[PDB]
Design a protein around this ligand. Structure first.
Ligand SMILES: [Mg+2]
Lengths: 135, 220, 109, 132, 303
RNA sequence: GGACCUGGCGGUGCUUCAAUCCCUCUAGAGGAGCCUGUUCUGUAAUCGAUAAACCCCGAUCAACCUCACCACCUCUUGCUCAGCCUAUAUACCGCCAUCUUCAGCAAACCUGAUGAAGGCUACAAAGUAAGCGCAAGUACCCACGUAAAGACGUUAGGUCAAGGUGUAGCCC
RNA sequence: AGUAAACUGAGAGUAGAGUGCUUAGUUGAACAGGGCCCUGAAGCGCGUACAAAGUGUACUGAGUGCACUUGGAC
């Protein structure tokens, strides 16, 4: 007997309204659970609309200050050979090591960007990193 | 019987998490399972914007905080239905995971329908099955998109019949009609296995707690 | 009908000119198709271009496939050239009448 | 199209019994004979008289039990006896049933010069074999 | 329902005891076959269809399983794949998939059962494409180095696809021989072929050449013995009756071939059977049909 | 007047086709006689059937009868609680023909933002469909073939002269 | 395909009456591969219609000339 108008209100709304009307003889099994623990959003039907004007998708891109260092390192040395073991969550690559050394070098007090980059390369070379150059 | 029904059914509703589902997963575990990897930004569906954390190189990232909250709610609701002995039906048309979903359903006792969905299996359930057939009290859409990247007809049919639907909605899904959406990744085998394990554990815990409480009531 | 006969002659000449070049396609041109005749349906609903078949069966099949694939492009080329203001759909039909003469002469030899 | 001894399809609201639902060609395969005697057997005689007796008895019973017979009447001719078996509705009073049974028995027996028995089986309603 | 079926079971047991008492047979040892015989006798029916006749069986065999409701008293379906609508079919598909996974991890005699056979096996209504899917999965299971543990399961879906040597009897004088029979059209022939003989072939007490004044019939008689190269090595007595001359010749030929089987080696018998000597002819005259002159001759089409 | 939806039509071509459209195999009809049916003439003097789907057909069959026709004569409550072979098959029942040498007919249910309307994709995407029919089953000699079956509709198809019957009319 | 063809019996009905009908049996083959004008059945589809077109302009007597539009097809 439940109303089959899925485009009008939610399942909870329709069931509650029909019960209040008395058309529904008794509340269905899940009604009490839904009432006790409603979802964050009422499952009301809603037709998607395509943005037309200057309105934009509010999804912001993801970046970090270290993305600059990563991009420059990739440009100067490429991907090298330390292939990404994406399964290890604690995995750190050569680019990650360069980023860390760049960050600590900046924290030292040195502020020039190009000097930070070159000195980071030299410091990792001293550490033993094979910073093979792409070109 | 009134005392029985009260003390059994209504007691769990008192506590926010009677089945202690929150311990079944952690944001770290979801991240390891890759629940947070969505489709490309171009494939994004407008209504998933609130759940999308952001875009990384034109790849959507699902906000695992929102996913954790939604999964808490969905697992809690599923456990409550299992405890109330409702019929839970797992639906998904991903042939890659059809076998896993069927086995998980068999193991947890609840039912599954992963094959082709004949028209009206819910709307015309009485004629397709019989007048006395009992319809599912809860549905779980492990995949809400049919093989043609369209919302599974079961979603709309469940909305029509007023059967609550938990559903793993991807960044290109349409969560408008899913009662309990769980924004996440539906394509990673690790993510799907995590979902299946979580639901199986929730159902098993709900049923065992139901049996334990029934025995406690009856012994006294 | 004299009008139909004139249309057939003009279409035969136009189609031969078309096939003389890679205009339709290099693949079609390389096949060196020869047209036996052109016949227009009495109602002007279709134009059958009878093309001579070769002995090789695979070659015949490939030529037929290419001709079927290029018929629409040839129709468009004609209607663009204005050789005929309106051209019905073009259908390519295999022609095998000369096989009887060939094999006769073979036996009679 | 064969119009012979068939119930044409309708909207599905037309209930029909076993006999009415089975067509002639099925005879001797799915449905037996409503009259069982030895007249038509090879080398026997009096087929015409057996047929006349069958027709007369059927009309007699149909007119005697208006709106009471819920199925066709099965005739058996053992030796010289006659047995008329009927399915009747439980709509007419038992006293009337018994009186009609005795009267028909005696009258047919005197008419045809042979013992006759009528056996009624009662049903709440005509036995529906399908709906057409 | 299940309670209804149990009641029918009790009623059938009581009826079985009634029948055993009526026939005087020990109810304890009273079997289904005995019940069958007794019911057949006690309710003589002349219907051609084995189904239209009466029956008194166990409710299991009697009733259609009607898929057994599928949901218990509570209303929870028994089969986890129940909501598919083809629960048994999809269960079988899942099982075959599991077996294929297991085999993948580890690593002119028959055919497949027809779709109707499979439908009866699964007590389910399938489609052509469903049958194709199942059969293709089964074929993959074959090709996947199916061992005994798997071939045993597969043979559950497989379907498998010689002339009888009559005894060599002996006469009063101890001479061996073999007797056989065969029918063609309306003719019947009984042929006795002796292990050893000078090629004499007496038909109806008459010499073969005299009885069959047609060299074609003589050739028919000669065909089997010529085929096995045993002409003049057997003496034959053939009694034929009924039908025309050609039918009689065919019947005698068939009978002689069958009788000679007993005396020729098994390979020779197989060769004869392949040739057609030993295969009974199914070609018989087709009855005239009403409204047409012949079995197929439609009357001259008027206009 | 505007925008749409469906059905109909071609004297519409290409490609598939069909004891099977034409050729291809055999046997025949038409040419002669006779048997026989029909139409026109004739007859005082027979009804119906009428392209496939009439034409040794209703008829498993006419010297009287049959017989319903013609001529003549005769009877009047009439074998019948009369009768009528007299009209009406373009009222029907009853029985059939044709496609059908088909396989579809289908009730009852369940998208177009609830318009006319629509409902297909198997690595499946809203269809399920009871029931009827084909099928299946059965007879004959198989598991074959032939029989049998052959639904809804088509031709106001036929049959009031099998019989029953609505309707029309006669009753010296 | 035991099909056609040929031949011979029997039955229904009558008092009698067929070369008619029904039915039984005997001997018993040939082609079976091509195509679609003709018939019909389909799909590919095309175009008809009921339940190329046009605007402006000018000549001629409906067409043509020039430009324009698709409110047409490829
Ligand atoms: Mg996805």
């Amino acid at each position: 007997a439940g109303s089959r108008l899925e485009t009008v209100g939610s399942i909870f709304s329709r069931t509650r309204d029909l019960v209040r009307a008395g058309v529904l003889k008794e509340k269905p099994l899940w009604f009490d659970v839904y009432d006790a623990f409603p979802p964050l959003r009422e499952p009301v039907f809603q037709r998607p609309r395509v943005r037309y004007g200057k309105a934009k998708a509010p999804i912001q891109d993801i970046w970090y200050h270290e993305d600059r260092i990563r991009a420059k390192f990739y440009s100067v040395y490429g991907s090298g050979q330390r292939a990404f073991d994406l399964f290890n969550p604690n995995f750190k690559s050569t680019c990650q090591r360069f980023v860390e050394k760049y960050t600590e070098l900046q924290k030292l007090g040195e502020t020039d960007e190009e000097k930070l980059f070159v000195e980071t390369g030299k410091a990792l070379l001293a550490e033993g990193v094979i910073l093979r150059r792409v070109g | 019987s009134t005392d029985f029904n009260d003390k059994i059914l209504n007691e769990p509703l008192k506590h926010s998490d009677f089945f202690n589902v929150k311990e079944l997963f952690s944001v770290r575990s979801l991240f390891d399972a890759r629940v947070h990897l969505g489709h490309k930004a171009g494939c994004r569906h407008r209504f998933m914007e609130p759940y999308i954390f952001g875009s990384r190189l034109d790849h959507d990232i699902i906000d695992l905080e929102q996913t954790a909250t939604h999964l808490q709610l969905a697992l809690n609701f599923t456990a409550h239905m299992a405890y109330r002995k409702g019929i839970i039906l797992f639906i998904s048309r991903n042939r890659q995971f059809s076998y896993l979903i069927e086995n998980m359903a068999r193991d947890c006792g609840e039912y599954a329908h992963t094959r082709y969905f004949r028209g009206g299996m819910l709307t015309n359930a009485r004629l397709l099955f019989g007048p006395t057939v009992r319809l599912p009290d809860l549905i779980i859409f492990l995949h809400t998109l049919n093989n043609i990247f369209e919302p599974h007809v079961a979603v709309r049919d469940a909305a029509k019949m007023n059967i609550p639907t938990v559903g793993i909605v991807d960044t290109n899904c349409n969560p408008c009609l899913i009662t309990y959406p769980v924004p996440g990744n539906d394509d990673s085998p690790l993510a799907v296995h995590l979902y299946c394990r979580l639901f199986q554990t929730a159902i098993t815990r709900a049923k065992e707690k139901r049996q334990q409480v029934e025995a406690l009531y009856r012994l006294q | 009908h004299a009008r139909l006969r004139a249309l057939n002659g003009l279409l035969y000449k136009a189609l031969t000119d078309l096939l003389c070049t890679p205009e339709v396609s290099q693949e079609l041109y390389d096949l060196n198709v020869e047209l036996s005749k052109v016949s227009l349906t009495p109602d002007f609903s279709a134009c059958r271009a009878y093309w001579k078949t070769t002995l090789s069966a695979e070659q015949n099949a490939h030529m037929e496939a290419v001709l079927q694939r290029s018929a629409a492009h040839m129709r468009h080329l004609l209607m663009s050239q204005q050789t005929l203001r309106n051209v019905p759909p073009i259908v390519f039909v295999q022609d095998k009448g000369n096989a009887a003469l060939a094999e006769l002469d073979q036996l009679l030899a | 199209k064969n119009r012979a001894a068939r119930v044409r399809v309708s909207k599905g609201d037309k209930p029909v019994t076993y006999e009415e639902a089975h067509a002639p060609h099925y005879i001797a395969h799915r449905k037996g004979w409503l009259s069982l005697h030895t007249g038509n057997l090879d080398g026997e005689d009096h087929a015409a008289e057996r047929t006349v007796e069958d027709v007369f008895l059927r009309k007699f019973m149909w007119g005697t039990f208006p709106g009471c017979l819920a199925d066709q009447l099965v005739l058996k001719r053992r030796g010289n006896q006659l047995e008329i078996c009927a399915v009747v509705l439980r709509q007419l009073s038992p006293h009337k049933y018994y009186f009609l049974v005795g009267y028909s028995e005696t009258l047919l027996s005197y008419f045809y010069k042979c013992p006759v028995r009528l056996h009624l089986q009662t049903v709440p309603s005509k036995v529906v074999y399908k709906y057409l | 329902t299940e309670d209804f079926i149990k009641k029918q079971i009790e009623e059938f047991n009581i009826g079985k005891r009634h029948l055993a008492n009526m026939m005087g047979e020990d109810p304890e040892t009273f079997t289904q076959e005995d019940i069958d015989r007794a019911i057949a006798y006690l309710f003589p029916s002349g219907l051609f269809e084995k189904r239209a006749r009466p029956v008194m069986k166990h409710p299991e065999q009697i009733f259609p399983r009607q898929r057994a409701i599928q949901w218990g008293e509570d209303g929870r379906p028994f089969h986890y794949l129940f909501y598919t609508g083809k629960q048994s079919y999809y269960s079988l598909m899942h099982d075959v998939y599991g077996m294929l996974l297991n085999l993948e991890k580890h690593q002119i005699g028959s055919r497949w059962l027809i779709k109707e056979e499979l439908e009866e096996m699964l007590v389910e209504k399938l489609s052509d494409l469903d049958y194709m899917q199942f059969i293709r999965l089964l074929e993959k299971l074959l090709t996947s180095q199916c061992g005994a543990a798997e071939e045993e399961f597969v043979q559950r879906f497989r379907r498998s696809v010689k002339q009888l040597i009559e005894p060599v009897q002996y006469d009063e004088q101890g001479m061996a021989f073999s007797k056989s029979e065969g029918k063609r059209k309306t003719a019947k022939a009984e042929a006795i072929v002796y292990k050893h003989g000078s090629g004499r072939i007496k038909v109806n007490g008459i010499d073969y050449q005299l009885y069959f004044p047609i060299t074609q019939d003589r050739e028919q008689l000669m065909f089997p013995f010529h085929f096995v190269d045993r002409l003049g090595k057997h003496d034959v007595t053939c009694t034929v009756s009924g039908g025309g001359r050609s039918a009689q010749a065919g019947a005698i030929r068939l009978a002689m071939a069958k009788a000679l089987c007993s005396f020729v080696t098994e390979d020779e018998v197989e060769w004869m059977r392949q040739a057609g000597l030993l295969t009974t002819d199914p070609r018989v005259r087709e009855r005239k049909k009403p409204g047409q002159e012949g079995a197929r001759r439609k009357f001259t089409w008027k206009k």
